[PDB]
Amino acid sequence: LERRTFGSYKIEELTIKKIPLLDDGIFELLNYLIDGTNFNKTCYCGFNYSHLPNLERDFNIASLYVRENFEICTDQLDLANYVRQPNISIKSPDFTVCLEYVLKTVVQETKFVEMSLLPLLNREEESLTEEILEGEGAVVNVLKLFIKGFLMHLGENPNSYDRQLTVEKYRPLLVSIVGYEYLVGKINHIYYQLATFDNYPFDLLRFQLSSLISTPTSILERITKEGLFKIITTVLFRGINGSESFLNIKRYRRF
Amino acid sequence: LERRTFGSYKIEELTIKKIPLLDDGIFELLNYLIDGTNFNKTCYCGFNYSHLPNLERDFNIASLYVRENFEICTDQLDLANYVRQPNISIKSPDFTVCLEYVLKTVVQETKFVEMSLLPLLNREEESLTEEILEGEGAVVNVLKLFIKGFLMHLGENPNSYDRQLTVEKYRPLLVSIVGYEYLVGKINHIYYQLATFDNYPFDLLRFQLSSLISTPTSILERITKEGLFKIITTVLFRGINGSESFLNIKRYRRF
Amino acid sequence: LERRTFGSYKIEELTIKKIPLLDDGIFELLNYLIDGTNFNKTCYCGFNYSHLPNLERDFNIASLYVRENFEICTDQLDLANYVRQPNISIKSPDFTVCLEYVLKTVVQETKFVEMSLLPLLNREEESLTEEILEGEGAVVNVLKLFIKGFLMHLGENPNSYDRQLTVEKYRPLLVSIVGYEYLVGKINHIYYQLATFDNYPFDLLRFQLSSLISTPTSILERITKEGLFKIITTVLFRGINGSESFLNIKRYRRF
Amino acid sequence: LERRTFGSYKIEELTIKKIPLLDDGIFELLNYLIDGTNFNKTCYCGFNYSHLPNLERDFNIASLYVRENFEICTDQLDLANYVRQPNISIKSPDFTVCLEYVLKTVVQETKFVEMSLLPLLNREEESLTEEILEGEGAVVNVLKLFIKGFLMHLGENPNSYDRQLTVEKYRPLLVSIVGYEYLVGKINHIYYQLATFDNYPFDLLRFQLSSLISTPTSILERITKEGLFKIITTVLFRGINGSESFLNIKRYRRF
Amino acid sequence: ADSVIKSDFSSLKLDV
Amino acid sequence: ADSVIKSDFSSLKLDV
Amino acid sequence: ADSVIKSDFSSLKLDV
Amino acid sequence: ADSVIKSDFSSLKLDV
């Protein structure tokens, strides 16, 4: 009903002849973080989390850090008349969460706010508080744990719609996990494969994941020479296979 | 690890055949207040506290007031050679916190100090500063919030050792909450039930708390006629069921 | 909970002041082999085993061979009244698994059975079936795979109790691995180091394992001249450093 | 009987079934230094010391420097009625030697004195005499020579109790050697290994010492960024493998 | 205790 | 999909 | 031990 | 331990 183990998804059935509808739960994750909500008050509480080390701790650290940032970005706005729509977008690769507000009257008309939770293109290490480095590190670890939770659920739960589903919507998380770990305290080939091939079907993923190949040395060195991202002055991602895919905005809604 | 939301407890496992070990966190609360420590430097910071109105404010007011009182009681002692043991006791019903000091050599030999934070048996209203009435009111509110925190955690977190745990160690807080609210600016039946029945098991409490009965009118009137406490000239408490339990000293240690 | 990748261990916490408790999983491995249990019905199934070549195949071959041997040793006994205790011992260097049976009444009184799975001191090559050489080769490979699993887990999972834990309980496996590979179809210095120094601490092992030194030529030649084992007519092992340790019986229980 | 080459140990046999008893000779070393005793009057005189360059010279310099420091710490005490017990402790990482005195009557009651011979956490280079820098440099070199003596004896003298003995008691010497050389006029991997892995068994050490691995570059750089020690405001040591062990007090007695 | 019913005590009349 | 093989990814090297 | 260096022993010469 | 190999550590790089 409400409660589900962190990172897991559900597959629902739309009918128009039936098509699958992936409930990835990314919206809900982001929403909780924005509200500063604590782990014990989430749909995620009360499952065994020995597979996800430090989930509750890092989740609450991250929740606070996101909450405070939100407040800083919204203290300079008057939002007493407005309501946050149940739509969150993510722009990449700074993991820029974007909210849209509209007037309680309509539901001056609409207002937008963006917070880059994991800024990657323009950073300061030396001129950054411990609060910020600790908050970021917690956000990233939460994302990693979400993806592990996703993968573990996928592994244990075959479904005949799997062939039609892909890791497409997880991309911004994956890109930020790879980007942050690289550009601030190596590249995890699992994360990098899934970010690169956002068209990875679920059944194929399950069967292949454990035999995934490492980053080719020509790519590793092209990365050290030129970054991971290629700015067009719109950002391109430097894939594990040398592809250069456009990282478009993803939109998430409440399910 | 270190961080926990205010009033919450942990249950750990001793083995001798396993028995539960309740970490009530009362020692730690007291210790912070004695050290004048501020909310932001406690294990309690960085959770949402909309459920606990004014926690940080009243905590810091109380922290100062306890700190200053401690200093007053210890300025007339030489403690440069000594160390405060990690043992705090509470005597009731004045909420008398008792510390024991020993020489850095041994760890003249040992020294004791007692501060009644919420004196109830012998008070002056007219001959008391605002500083003192404000400090006391803050201490009492902090205690009430701690208990609310405890209860909320209990409600949300069943555990199979609940049947073997009771509210026993919370008694001095509960007695002082009820005593102070009564004898200085009515009786809250929840607080009074828990102070009376210090043997209330956790699982039973959770199931029953929301349907707790009000103070019988014969008791209410016996209170107005005779106090709440019965001094034996050793103090007895006048329970919500007409019992007359002895309020013994409780000893708290660091976990 | 139940499922774990082959060879891996868990570290649990006893308290008496906390001490670590190593769950090596050797008992469970042996138990399965005795029951002839097939890979797909073990706690080990459903992980990727590309790191452990032929695990399922060789495990099932070995499982059958041990099962049949057990039956041969127990067909000449009446065990209808009795129960196998959850205690398995191993005597070295023939990898002699020892079971103890007691009457369903007590749980004539107790009965013992011993099967040398990898006999090393007195063998026949020419007068031995293919069934036996194939079964033995499978048992040995399973043991090698268990140790590889153990080492891999150790490498990836630091723990602060490592400093107090040693490879002590793995000795019979390690001695039989080295013994069988030598005396029947060279010496692997990793296996030999760990068999010799059964006091190797986990943290030290992890840091040092990859830079382990080869067998000194004076030892290699003392081996070719005199065996590996020294019978006292009780067996002594000829260590990689020239030590001559006694190989005592090890006892394993269900965790 | 009395005389032994510097740094060497003896292994004796207690029986209770026999257990080894390591006579490390650290107490005796410290005692001599405290008494200002000169090399020629120690159990160490009259062996060849070409393996230990400058032993007699540096020992006497160090002996004087420790003696004078002792006197400075004890001139402000009346100890005419008292006797130094045959117990010396070392607290780390300042190589803080701690003595306990008791009244000739009992053998006001007991008195304690601590001298940090090699202070590491809080130092002045510019505001320090040559006498002090020369005394410290001599103490450290003596410690290094003691350890070399220990290692050379270990190498030449196998014993069947080796497997049960570890370098545990040498830790404070090893930590101060590494700490002082680093924080005042690079890291010796031998010293750093033994300080880190205070659980190194004697037989394993002998076999492995000559093939010891260098400090990983990730650790070297974590050291330059953050120290070696991590103060908890109790000190933690930053191990060669990234461990963070607590440096507890060691107690030495006369054998 | 996985089956035990949870309760929300956040609205109890606790004079805070 | 009741016949599809399940995989346990709980031990994958995911830097957590 | 969160800072302890991990080792990958999957490529050790273990004759498997 | 009469069979244990001895080692000469007199030439170890011990900065003395």
Distance, CA of A22 to CA of A9 (rounded, Å):
7
Q: What is the DSSP letter of D237?
A: E
DSSP tag of B141: H
User: Residue E6 has what DSSP assignment?
Assistant: P
* Method used to determine the 3D structure: X-ray
Q: Which chains touch G (3 or more CB pairs under 8 A)?
A: C, D
Residue B5: closest CA among A206, E10, A155, D227: E10
Collapsing DSSP states into helix, strand and coil, what is residue B75? helix
A145 closest CB neighbour out of F1, F5, F16: F16
Number of domains in chain B: 1
SS3 for C216-248 is: CHHHHHHHHHHCCEEECCCEEECCCCCCCCECC
Q: With contacts defined as CB-CB under 8 Å, which chain C residues touch H1?
A: 243
Written as six digits, the tokens of B208 are 């029953």
Contact C241 D201 (CB under 8 A): no
As a 3-state breakdown, chain E gives helix, strand, coil percent values, each rounded to 5, of: 0, 0, 100
Return d(Cα C11, Cα C13) in angstroms, integer: 7
Instruction: Flag if A158 and F13 touch (Cβ within 8 Å).
Output: no
What is d(CA C150, CA C11) in angstroms, rounded to the nearest whole number?
Answer: 13
Chains that touch A (3 or more CB pairs under 8 A): B, C, F
Alpha carbons within 13 A on the beta-carbon side of A40: 16
Measured distance between the N- and C-terminal CA atoms of chain H, rounded to whole angstroms: 30
Q: Are A19 and A245 contacting, i.e. CB atoms less than 8 angstroms apart? A: no
Residues on chain G touching D243 (C-beta within 8 angstroms): 1, 3-4
Distance CA A188, CA A228 (A): 13
Measured CA to CA, the distance from residue D66 to residue D116 in angstroms comes to 10
Quote the minimal CA–CA distance from B102 to chain D in Å: 15
Burial of A189 (0-12, 13-18, 19+ CB in 10 A): middle
DSSP lists the bridge partners of residue C102 as C83, C110
DSSP assigned state of F1: -
N- to C-terminal Cα separation, chain F: 30
Mutate: best of D161, D198, D208, partner C, most C CBs <10 A: D208
Q: Say how far apart CA A85 and CA A100 lie, in whole Å.
A: 6
State the best of D207, D218, D245 to mutate against chain C, taking most chain C CBs within 10 Å.
D207
**Cβ-based interface (< 8 Å): residues of G facing C:** 1-2, 4-10, 12-16
Chains E and F touch (3+ CB pairs under 8 A): no
A164 close to F (CB below 8 A)? no
User: Judged by CB atoms within 8 Å, which residues 30-59 of A form the interface with F?
Assistant: 51-53
Of the candidates A42, A92, A90, A34, which has an alpha carbon nearest to the alpha carbon of residue A66? A34
D219 touching G (Cβ < 8 Å) = yes
Buried b (16+ CB within 10 A) or exposed e, B111-124: bebebbbbbbeeee
Tell me how far apart the alpha carbons of residues B245 and B198 are, in angstroms, rounded to a whole number.
10
In terms of Cα–Cα distance, which of B170, A170, B34, D166 is closest to D174?
Answer: D166
The tokens describing B111, both together, are 């020294």
In chain A, positions 82-141, which contact chain F (CB-CB < 8 Å)?
A: 141
Domain hosting C20: range is 1-255
The answer to whether A83 touches A101, Cβ cutoff 8 Å, is yes
H4/C241 touch (CB, cutoff 8 Å), yes or no: yes
Q: Is C60 helix (H, G, I), strand (E, B) or coil?
A: helix
Q: Min CA distance, D187 vs chain C (Å)?
A: 17
CB atoms within 10 A of CB C93: 24
The two structure tokens encoding residue B26? 């009362």
Residues in chain H: 16
Tokens of D204: 């394993």
- Please choose, from the candidates D127, D77, D82, the residue with its C-alpha nearest in 3D space to the C-alpha of residue D104: D82
Containing H/E element for B114?
strand B110-116
**Chain A residue closest to F4 (CA)?**
A158
Report the chain E residue with the minimal C-alpha distance to residue B143.
E16
Q: What angle do CA C113, C117, C119 make, to 5 degrees?
A: 105
Three-state DSSP string of D71-111: HHHHHCCCCCCEEEEEEEEEECCCCEEEEEEEECCCCCCEE
Query: Alpha-carbon distance A233 to B3, whole Å?
Result: 45
CB atoms within 10 A of CB D86: 12
Which residues of F sit within 8 Å Cβ distance of A?
Answer: 1-2, 4-10, 12-16
Cα separation of C223 and D97, whole Å? 50
Whole-angstrom Cα distance, residue A130 to residue A128? Answer: 7
